[PDB]
Amino acid sequence: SIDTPNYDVQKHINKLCGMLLITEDANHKFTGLIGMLYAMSRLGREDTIKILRDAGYHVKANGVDVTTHRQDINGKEMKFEVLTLASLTTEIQINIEIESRKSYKKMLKEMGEVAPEYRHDSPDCGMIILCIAALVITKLARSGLTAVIRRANNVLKNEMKRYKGLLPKDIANSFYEVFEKHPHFIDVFVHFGIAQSSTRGGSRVEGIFAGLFMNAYG
């Protein structure tokens, strides 16, 4: 049973990436999986199922939809937008949102209203996560972990400055873990990276990803 998110939940998964990126001392246990979900939502359900079946994997495709979950947090009833994921519980998703809202309020207290580039909903959050995945893929092509961190601190210096939760060591470990545990994600990531690196222009981060991905050959 593999979750195959479609184009419709790409905005949601990007926001989930962003919520972890704004979290001070964020727990990156699920970042490898969330990053992979973002890549699949970019490829689309159709292409994702095609890649897995072509790679010889047998797949039970799980539809990914946005649902509203009502949960009581500190006496107050709260509405949370969650994704129907077999790989990621409602509880985990909500706790990611709770912890990021705590970090966000601390940011308001520090600098007032937050600039677009410092928010959890900045359009490049998913790609920022996938830049670490691109570095891990190079070193798999866990000894190369120190080199991933050192290459990450230089290439993602502006992004690390923007996001308190951009912790290269934790994110790289999460990707190493997911690629070891679920090797079918390597095939998904590689097809994602080939397709992405063909797109012209776009954002600074889309450009950094393309350069990092191209480096896995030369």
Ligand SMILES: O=C(O)c1cc(C(=O)O)n(Cc2ccc(F)cc2)n1
């Ligand atoms: O500027 C604000 O007061 C603002 C904006 C949003 C939103 O875009 O939903 N939110 C909700 C929100 C804030 C932080 C967070 F990590 C998750 C959700 N707060």
